[PDB]
Amino acid sequence: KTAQQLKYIKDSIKTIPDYPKAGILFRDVTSLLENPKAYSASIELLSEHYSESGVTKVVGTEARGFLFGAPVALALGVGFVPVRKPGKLPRETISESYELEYGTDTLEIHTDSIQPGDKVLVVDDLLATGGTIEATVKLIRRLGGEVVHAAFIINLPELGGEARLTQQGIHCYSLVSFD
Amino acid sequence: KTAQQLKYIKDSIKTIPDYPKAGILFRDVTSLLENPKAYSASIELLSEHYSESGVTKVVGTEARGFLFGAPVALALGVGFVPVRKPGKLPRETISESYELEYGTDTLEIHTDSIQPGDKVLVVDDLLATGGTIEATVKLIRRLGGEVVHAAFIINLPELGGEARLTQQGIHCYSLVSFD
Ligand SMILES: Nc1ncnc2c1ncn2[C@@H]1O[C@H](COP(=O)(O)O)[C@@H](O)[C@H]1O
Ligand SMILES: Nc1ncnc2c1ncn2[C@@H]1O[C@H](COP(=O)(O)O)[C@@H](O)[C@H]1O
Ligand SMILES: [Cl-]
Ligand SMILES: [Cl-]
Ligand code: NA
Ligand code: NA
Ligand code: NA
Numbered sequence: 386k387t388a389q390q391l392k393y394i395k396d397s398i399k400t401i402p403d404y405p406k407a408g409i410l411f412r413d414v415t416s417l418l419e420n421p422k423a424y425s426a427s428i429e430l431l432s433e434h435y436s437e438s439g440v441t442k443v444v445g446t447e448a449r450g451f452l453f454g455a456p457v458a459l460a461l462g463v464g465f466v467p468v469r470k471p472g473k474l475p476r477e478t479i480s481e482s483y484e485l486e487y488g489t490d491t492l493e494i495h496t497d498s499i500q501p502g503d504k505v506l507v508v509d510d511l512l513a514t515g516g517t518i519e520a521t522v523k524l525i526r527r528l529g530g531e532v533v534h535a536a537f538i539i540n541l542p543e544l545g546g547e548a549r550l551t552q553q554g555i556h557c558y559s560l561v562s563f564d
Numbered sequence: 565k566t567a568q569q570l571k572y573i574k575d576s577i578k579t580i581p582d583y584p585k586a587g588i589l590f591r592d593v594t595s596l597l598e599n600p601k602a603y604s605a606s607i608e609l610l611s612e613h614y615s616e617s618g619v620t621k622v623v624g625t626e627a628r629g630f631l632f633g634a635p636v637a638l639a640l641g642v643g644f645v646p647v648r649k650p651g652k653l654p655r656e657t658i659s660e661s662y663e664l665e666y667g668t669d670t671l672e673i674h675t676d677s678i679q680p681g682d683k684v685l686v687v688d689d690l691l692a693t694g695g696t697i698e699a700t701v702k703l704i705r706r707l708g709g710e711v712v713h714a715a716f717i718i719n720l721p722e723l724g725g726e727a728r729l730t731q732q733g734i735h736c737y738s739l740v741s742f743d
């Protein structure tokens with residue numbers, strides 16, 4: 386039933402060793418996207434999960450996050466709001482910066498697209514360190530939105546992101562997990 | 565019926581003057597994405613249009629193209645294949661470079677994701693000069709795929725892209741047009 390669907394999704398994901406550099410096992414969701422069965426099931430399962438949750442908006446980060454969050458938004462009948470790298474959004478934004486191993490990056494959101502009252506689901510392709518999602522959550526909360534759920538296709542629990550998101554009050558759901 | 569749906573889509577799109585620089589009228593699809601009615605109708609109309617076309621794959625370019633092509637792919641029950649900026653795809657790629665006003669850029673696709681026989685629909689947010697779509701088409705055709713249709717939310721016919729795509733043998737369909 387679901388174990389079989391979850392397995393077919395997991396099997397559809399390819400692993401590319403040593404990309405982008407030696408040691409990393411890259412989990413490639415493009416092999417899932419190209420399999421209509423695996424892709425459609427992914428969206429079904431993520432949106433099923435929040436069907437009674439009261440969600441009013443879905444937020445996904447650029448660019449692979451768009452591929453899972455916008456279809457979940459359409460499946461729930463709610464608007465989709467992107468969080469982008471800087472200088473890509475044309476109306477008024479706020480921004481949040483997040484530490485990387487070396488250096489910092491920044492994400493932005495349209496100030497008009499979240500307002501007090503909104504219940505927001507974050508959806509992304511993959512949870513690693515959690516830094517992007519932590520910055521996204523702070524963006525949505527600055528704008529009065531309530532977020533307590535982030536959903537992913539893939540969780541890499543060894544990298545600590547779930548743990549970090551837990552400390553921000555976010556519950557994470559992932560379809561599959563790799564070690 | 566449809567004139568009313570097309571109008572509601574057009575009205576949902578905001579225009580930001582002088583972004584990213586003076587003179588440009590930026591057409592912002594994020595106001596459409598945040599309106600579940602306008603977003604859902606957009607995808608309905610694009611996928612309706614190709615419902616009897618024999619499509620086996622949809623190709624969309626990063627990043628806003630993902631927001632329209634992947635939902636069309638799911639609506640047609642076909643796989644979605646991204647075309648990306650360089651160094652973002654992990655398996656074997658080919659690439660195409662395209663002239664910009666100043667300088668050049670490049671797009672890549674996974675060689676395994678298109679093969680002879682595939683009938684490919686390209687879907688993007690907006691048609692301006694046509695340079696990205698021309699490079700995408702050459703990528704898909706190098707891999708044995710047949711493409712004669714590109715679909716957009718928005719066409720800016722003054723910028724010449726439709727004309728250029730016509731000369732590559734591509735038929736373009738857009739929901740709306742601005743001047
Ligand atoms: N091993 C990996 N395989 C594929 N993508 C990854 C991997 N590690 C990190 N990523 C990507 O990096 C993004 C940012 O992750 P985070 O460190 O959770 O902010 C994720 O959403 C993935 O797109
Ligand atoms: N006036 C505009 N408003 C919004 N986006 C634009 C505009 N002009 C160009 N673009 C974007 O530039 C991308 C590349 O367009 P092209 O020149 O057709 O390769 C489009 O797919 C749009 O995302
Ligand atoms: Cl800010
Ligand atoms: Cl090449
Ligand atoms: Na991501
Ligand atoms: Na707001
Ligand atoms: Na585009």
Ligand code: NA
Nearest residue numbers: 675676678679
């Ligand atoms: Na191929």
